[PDB]
Amino acid sequence: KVFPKLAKAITLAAKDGGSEPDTNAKLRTAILNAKAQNMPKDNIDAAIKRASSKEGNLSEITYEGKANFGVLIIMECMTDNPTRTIANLKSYFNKTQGASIVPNGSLEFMFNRKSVFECLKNEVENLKLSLEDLEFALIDYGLEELEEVEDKIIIRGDYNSFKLLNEGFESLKLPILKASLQRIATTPIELNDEQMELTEKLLDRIEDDDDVVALYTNIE
């Protein structure tokens, strides 16, 4: 469900970055995420050690697809067998009428790559700084927008601003609940209840695949 995939990001990051967090930014980000989610220490350690084994040959691959109702799908996967992955995904689409995987690039310019940092509303108040100060401060570190979602603050910035934004959060000594790179549709679409239900069928099968670590749609 959630741990296996959070474990895959720790292994992948270690394989092409080293098993030393102090010198591997991505590994730190992966570790931070797993921790905030409440993955036991031994598990993480197990994910870092896996990179140096026959089970550490993971890769990040993105697939693109479309479905009825003008739906566009971006699937991010980490797998130890791209052949198996592409085959399973195709079996999911070849089960839903009107849906199909398309060549990468087909959705170009339809989505935006953004850095998304989630923070706890209680953490911000901890070091006593307003949301106004948080925004003013992070504007110099890549912040494009600040949104509020009960008990937590979500800060977004361009994809390339990931590293810097992390710097900002660390400068303010503000704990990060979750840091990631997400694909956000440029032109969101809204489906009626009937459409959402029909689409949900396909979206649930995909999300359930053990290789799909991220799923982005143009749905609002």
UniProtKB/Swiss-Prot annotation:
What domain of life does the UniProt record list for this protein's source? Bacteria
Q: Which GO terms describe its biological process?
A: regulation of DNA-templated transcription
InterPro entries cross-referenced by the UniProt entry: Integrase-like_N, TACO1_YebC-like_2nd/3rd_dom, TACO1_YebC_N, Transcrip_reg_TACO1-like, Transcrip_reg_TACO1-like_dom3, YebC-like
Q: Which UniProt keywords apply?
A: Cytoplasm, DNA-binding, Transcription, Transcription regulation
Compartment(s) of residence:
Cytoplasm
Q: Is Transcription regulation found in the keyword set?
A: yes
Q: Which GO terms describe its cellular component?
A: cytosol
Annotated signal sequence range: none
- Offer an example of a GO molecular function term for this protein: DNA binding
* Coarse class of the protein's main subcellular location: cytoplasm
What Pfam families does this protein map onto? TACO1_YebC_N, Transcrip_reg
Assigned protein family: Belongs to the TACO1 family.
The protein's matches in NCBIfam families, at most eight in alphabetical order, are given as:
PRK12378.1 (NF009044), YebC/PmpR family DNA-binding transcriptional regulator (TIGR01033)
Name the chain's protein. Probable transcriptional regulatory protein HP_0162
Q: Which organism is it from?
A: Helicobacter pylori (strain ATCC 700392 / 26695) (Campylobacter pylori)
